[PDB]
Ligand binder design. Structure first.
Ligand code: HEM
Ligand SMILES: CC1(C)SCCN(S(=O)(=O)c2ccc(Oc3ccncc3)cc2)[C@H]1C(=O)NO
Ligand SMILES: [Zn+2]
Ligand SMILES: [Zn+2]
Length: 467
């Protein structure tokens, strides 16, 4: 069939000069408006197809799910112990190694707490610590990002590592620091080159600085894993994912095919931990920013929290069903924050058809989630913070199909169930006991965030006064 349209490619650079990597989301909007919902790009040697809108993304990830569940190979990951039976989950290639960790991560989380009141109470406990930390700032203006990252990170640590860390633990802080730095490494020109030419890694000079943060991250994590291997009580049912993983490694000794091995234990755990320390807290960072930028909405939320929960009892997942306005606000924060605009790259394993065009095997697929979350054809005021995007005239919460912050298909975020719970409990817990606002004498903060693979709100301070 006919391949997707797109800007005319240069001789060797291809379309590298037709894409503004400073604000790619905007550049792609222009391309979408110019060539359509499914267009092509030749980034150097990598053929790319961008998917815009719910339909294009869905036909690829759901309808053609089997053929689009693979990731682009990333040979550089070798530096972290990645191998055929050791791929973690996020960067894992479509196959048994992924499926085994995928199924394991999903079911273990569910067994450990997800969907039960135990996790809720654990989270609201961590929430209480978060509140107390906010209170230490008295009326003084501060940046909530660090405390949000620490509190959220403790929830995933509890699940994976069976413990939390004090907001000032050196190892905890270093772990969080390295995790955020390495999120800068995933976006480097050098990595692209070494990735195309695997052999170039034999030069210690290069290999030695390519993924230094991810390596530091894993190294720092090994120390924690080693202590855990020591405290673990195999005579009791696993308390966390690391123990569950460990018990599987026992059962799997002698099985060359099992992905439950030492190399993969640090990758899987680092996979879940890192993912959990940089997603939800960012959304929460957007949440608090939007709440000081729209005090009215913040009050409506507090009002609902008062009417349904009060200012005593700790929030509970059972409350959400009776808090449609707060649920709408949270969903809008996710929609507007648009924290993962271009999603995570996919790769076709077979030739497929999308919106009439043909997408050859091996094509790097880009799911433009931002275009689904800001689709002017679907949302009323896509470029505005508008809780009514998830509310009907009656005040009922409705979730449109264009709400794909987590993508779709067999590869969709496995942390969604955890994210849903964290956002509700942490958000209501914060607004239930605090009142946020822009610090007098300071300019209204921008609702425009700084572009990256993971989009954070622009730096800002706020005042948190008790209630
Ligand atoms: C509000 C927060 C979050 C957002 C917006 C988000 C978004 C995403 C997106 C866009 C993907 C890619 C889906 C695809 O490949 O098409 C994904 C993947 C993934 N996320 Fe998240 N995520 C969030 C939270 C977390 C959390 C809390 C965890 C849990 C540890 C997590 C774990 C993962 C994992 C393991 C994958 C890879 C799944 C696979 O390839 O099979 N994420 N997420
Ligand atoms: C275990 C690894 C160190 S292996 C090498 C790469 N990373 S990473 O720290 O660079 C990273 C962190 C967050 C991220 O963003 C996410 C995740 C989930 N949902 C939405 C966004 C992407 C990549 C770790 C990894 O695979 N995590 O999943
Ligand atoms: Zn444990
Ligand atoms: Zn209704």
């Amino acid at each position: 069939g006919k391949l997707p349209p797109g800007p005319l490619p240069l001789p060797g650079l291809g379309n590298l000069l037709h894409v503004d990597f400073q604000n790619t989301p905007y550049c792609f909007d222009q391309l979408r408006r110019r060539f359509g919902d499914v267009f092509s790009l030749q980034l150097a040697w990598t053929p790319v197809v961008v998917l815009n809108g719910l339909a294009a993304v869905r036909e690829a990830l759901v309808t053609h799910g089997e053929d689009t569940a693979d990731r682009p190979p990333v040979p550089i990951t070798q530096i972290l112990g990645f191998g055929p039976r050791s791929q973690g989950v996020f960067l894992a290639r479509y196959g048994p190694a992924w499926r085994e960790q995928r199924r394991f991560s999903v079911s273990t989380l569910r067994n450990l707490g997800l969907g039960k009141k135990s996790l809720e109470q654990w989270v609201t406990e961590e929430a209480a610590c978060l509140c107390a930390a906010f209170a230490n700032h008295s009326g003084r203006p501060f940046r909530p990002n660090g405390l949000l990252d620490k509190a959220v990170s403790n929830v995933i640590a509890s699940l994976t590592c069976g413990r939390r860390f004090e907001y000032d633990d050196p190892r905890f802080l270093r772990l969080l620091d390295l995790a955020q730095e390495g999120l800068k490494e995933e976006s480097g020109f050098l990595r692209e080159v070494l990735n195309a030419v695997p052999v170039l890694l034999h030069i210690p000079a290069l290999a030695g600085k390519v993924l230094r943060f991810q390596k530091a991250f894993l190294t720092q994590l090994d120390e924690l894993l080693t202590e855990h291997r020591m405290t673990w009580d195999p005579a009791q049912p696993p308390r966390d994912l690391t123990e569950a993983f460990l018990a599987e490694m026992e059962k799997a000794k002698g099985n060359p095919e099992s992905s439950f091995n030492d190399e993969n234990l640090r990758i899987v755990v680092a996979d879940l931990f890192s993912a959990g320390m940089v997603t939800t807290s960012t959304t929460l960072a957007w949440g608090l920013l939007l709440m000081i930028l729209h005090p009215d909405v913040q009050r409506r939320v507090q009002q609902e929290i008062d009417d349904v929960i009060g200012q005593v009892r700790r929030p509970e997942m059972g409350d959400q069903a009776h808090m449609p306005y707060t649920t709408a606000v949270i969903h809008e924060v996710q929609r507007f924050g648009d924290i993962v605009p271009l999603g995570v790259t996919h790769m076709t394993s077979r030739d497929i058809e999308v919106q009439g065009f043909r997408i050859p095997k091996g094509t790097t697929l880009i799911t433009n989630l931002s275009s689904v979350l800001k689709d002017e054809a679907v949302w009323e005021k896509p470029f505005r913070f508008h809780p009514e995007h998830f509310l009907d005239a009656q005040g009922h919460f409705v979730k449109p199909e264009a709400f794909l912050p987590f993508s779709a298909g067999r590869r969709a975020c496995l942390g969604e169930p955890l994210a849903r719970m964290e956002l509700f409990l942490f958000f209501t817990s914060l607004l239930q006991h605090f009142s946020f606002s822009v610090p007098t004498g300071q300019p209204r903060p921008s609702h425009h965030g700084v572009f990256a693979f993971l989009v954070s709100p622009s730096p800002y301070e706020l005042c948190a006064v008790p209630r």
